[PDB]
Design a protein around this nucleic acid. Structure first.
Ligand code: ZN
Lengths: 60, 303, 49, 49, 145, 84
DNA sequence: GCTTGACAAAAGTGTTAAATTGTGCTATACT
DNA sequence: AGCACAATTTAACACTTTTGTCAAGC
């Protein structure tokens, strides 16, 4: 900026256990004149891991 | 060194045209087509023309075609400037360009100098459409008619728009409502949109084996079955021996064991020279005889 | 790879029949030439498809 | 080509290479290459060798 | 399939050899119908050329049993034979313009370049439309004029 | 059961296409050559689609009336005459 | 041991109405 | 892109032939 500011992050969609069960990704949507939704944003568990499509991944 | 570099070095040699030149070439082209058609029509209608004038019209064609070629070679830059935007969408840059030139050719054939509009105005439409229409006909390994490529892109557009409004991927119901079609249709559509994957890819670690290696050939013969099947044919042969000579043949023909093609009651009755009902009666008795424990117990294992 | 070859080959017939300029036609033969090269030994000349 | 165009012929692409191979006497091109003389100690003969 | 052959020989495959091998020219860059998922006609996978998908079954189906083999269906143009032929039969593509075999052009040393005395950097400019080559010349007319 | 039909291509090559004895024999057959072939015996009844492919003349006639074209040609001819 | 005429279902065959599919086209100017 | 229009394929269907089946009978 200038070409966007104050991006938002809603509470997580589903719980870690609920994500691993339904095979979905642990993410929280983010937002950013016209308001824009940028997409579901993955989140890191307390164990320092991510749930990407129901599987527990770790970034090295 | 590089080919796309060469094509640009040649189109860049041609001199761009102003508004006045375009109309002159446009005129010469239309004069070339009518002159050529007039000479052909005069022979059909049994008419002649002044010698000197007739030879003048013939030259109008040579000058007309030079006008056509000259008009195209000047606006080749326009084709490229439009072809840059469609790269990386599954079509080589050159292929986009050549398809653009195809569209460009048509624009020249339909351009109208009397309207007074700059040529690039009307050529951009055809060149643009020529490229897009090409992608719908060639970009996909499994071709999809343009009307389906049309709706697929429309659905993705609604999806992307609905995605931006709701903040969540729209469900089939939401996506079907906004698109005024059945949710099952969007599903059927979403199956068509999927493109294939490369067998020559390497799913195994460090090129241990390509993906194609893991594909079963389910049609391949099964050794154990070809042997059991062979033993079944042999076992039925014996069972056929217990039946009547004619009765065994009826069973063969009815199921086509001998010639591999079954026969209707009439056809079977035609070879034995009796009614088609008589064959129906005979067959039923064969099955009863076949369901007898002595003859039938041996074949249960073959399921 | 065959698709790229048969596509460019067909487009060439189209251009030949359309009496198109030699720049466009020659540009097609060059494109056809490179498609067969890629079909046989892709990458042996220029960037691979 | 504008002048002298009727004295020669020229082309591009594989078809031109196809022509050069057409009018190509294999035996004639060999005998002139059979020259084990014409110096030869230099690579010029090896280039032909 | 005797399993005892004495020799094994190669050689440049001529256009005729290729045409003789093929069972028909593939005319379209199509694979299979996006709906039926069956091989498109005149294109790649065309049963009319490469072979049927099912044993002793033509494309349309007017011939299905093993009763008739070695014949061709007068509707879909599919020969009724084993589906394996789909792995032994080849097609071909008639080119609207000749093309150089990359193995003899870019293969170092240039087999064609050595065959006509054209440097590989010069020959590359010819077959890729970067320069003109003199194919013929009229010596008598050039000398008389 | 096998019917043996022979077709003739435009370039002069001939092909044998076995068919079933009972079924109809086509008049034209897509041959190994890649070209269409007409059968030698049996009469052809070849109903050519007869669709005339649209040409540049068709696209010009549908915008210029023959009079407008005639006037243009006079301009061009009156121009070539003047050049002499 | 076989055939008849009934009747039905099943398989075709010709005639029509969707639907699917392929092609053409869009004129501020745009190189 | 989107739509118009023509061409072609697919469906739909009515209708006829074919095929299997029951009963009663020679
Ligand atoms: Zn068939």
């Amino acid at each position: 900026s200038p070409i966007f500011s104050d991006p938002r992050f809603d509470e997580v969609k589903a719980s870690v256990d609920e994500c691993k069960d339904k095979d979905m990704t642990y993410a929280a949507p983010l937002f950013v004149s016209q308001t824009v939704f940028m997409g579901d944003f993955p989140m890191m568990t307390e164990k320092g891991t991510f749930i990407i499509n129901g599987t527990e991944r770790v970034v090295v | 060194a590089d080919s796309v570099r060469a094509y640009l070095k040649q189109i860049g040699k041609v001199a761009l045209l102003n508004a006045e030149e375009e109309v002159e070439l446009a005129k010469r082209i239309e004069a070339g087509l009518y002159a050529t058609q007039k000479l052909a029509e005069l022979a059909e209608k049994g008419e002649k023309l002044p010698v000197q004038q007739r030879r003048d019209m013939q030259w109008i064609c040579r000058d007309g075609d030079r006008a056509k070629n000259h008009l195209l070679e000047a606006n080749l830059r326009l084709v490229v400037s439009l072809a840059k935007r469609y790269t990386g969408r599954g079509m080589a840059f050159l292929d986009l360009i050549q398809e653009g030139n195809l569209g460009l050719i048509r624009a020249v054939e339909k351009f109208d100098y009397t309207k007074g509009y700059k040529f690039s105005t009307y050529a951009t439409w055809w060149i643009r459409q020529a490229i897009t229409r090409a992608m719908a006909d060639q970009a996909r390994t499994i071709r999809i008619p343009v009307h389906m490529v049309e709706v697929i892109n429309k659905l993705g557009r609604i999806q992307r728009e609905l995605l931006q409004d709701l903040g969540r991927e729209p469900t089939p119901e939401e996506l079907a409502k906004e698109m005024d079609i059945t949710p099952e249709k969007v599903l059927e559509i979403q199956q068509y949109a999927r493109e294939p994957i490369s067998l020559d890819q390497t799913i195994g670690d460090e090129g241990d084996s390509q993906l194609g290696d893991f594909i079963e050939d389910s049609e391949a013969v099964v050794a154990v079955d070809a042997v059991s099947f062979t033993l079944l044919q042999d076992q039925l042969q014996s069972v056929l021996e217990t039946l009547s000579e004619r009765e065994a043949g009826v069973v063969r023909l009815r199921f086509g064991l001998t010639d591999g093609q079954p026969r209707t009651l009439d056809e079977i009755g035609q070879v034995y020279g009796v009614t088609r009902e008589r064959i129906r009666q005979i067959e039923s008795k064969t099955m009863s005889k076949l369901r007898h424990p002595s003859r039938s117990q041996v074949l249960r294992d073959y399921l | 790879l065959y698709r790229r070859v048969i596509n460019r080959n067909n487009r060439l017939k189209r251009l030949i029949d359309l009496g198109a300029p030699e720049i466009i036609v020659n540009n097609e033969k060059r494109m056809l030439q490179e498609s067969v090269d890629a079909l046989f030994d892709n990458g042996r000349r220029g960037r691979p498809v | 080509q504008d002048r002298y165009g009727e004295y020669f012929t020229g082309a591009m692409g594989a078809e031109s290479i196809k022509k050069l191979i057409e009018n190509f006497d294999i035996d004639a091109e060999a005998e002139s290459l059979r020259e084990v003389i014409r110096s030869g100690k230099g690579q010029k003969k090896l280039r032909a060798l | 399939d005797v399993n005892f052959f004495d020799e094994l020989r190669i050689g440049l495959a001529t256009a005729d050899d290729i045409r003789n091998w093929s069972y028909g020219e593939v005319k379209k860059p199509e694979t299979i119908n996006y709906r039926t998922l069956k091989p498109e006609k005149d294109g790649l996978f065309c049963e009319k050329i490469f072979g049927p998908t099912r044993d002793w079954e033509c494309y349309c189906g007017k011939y299905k049993r093993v009763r008739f083999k070695g014949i061709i269906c007068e509707r879909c143009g599919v020969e009724v034979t084993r589906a394996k032929v789909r792995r032994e039969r080849m097609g071909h593509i008639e080119l609207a313009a000749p093309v150089t075999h990359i193995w003899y052009f870019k293969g170092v040393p240039s087999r064609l370049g050595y065959l006509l005395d054209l440097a590989p950097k010069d020959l590359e400019k010819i077959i890729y439309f970067a320069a003109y080559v003199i194919t013929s010349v009229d010596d008598e007319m050039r000398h008389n004029e | 059961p096998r019917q043996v039909a022979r077709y003739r291509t435009d370039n002069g090559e001939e092909f044998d296409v076995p068919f079933a004895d009972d079924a109809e024999i086509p008049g034209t057959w897509l041959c190994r050559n890649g070209l269409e072939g007409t059968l030698i015996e049996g009469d052809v009844p070849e109903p050519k689609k007869v669709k005339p492919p649209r040409t540049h003349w068709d696209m010009l006639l549908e915008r210029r009336s023959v009079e407008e074209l005639e006037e243009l040609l006079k301009e061009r001819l009156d121009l070539i005459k003047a050049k002499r």
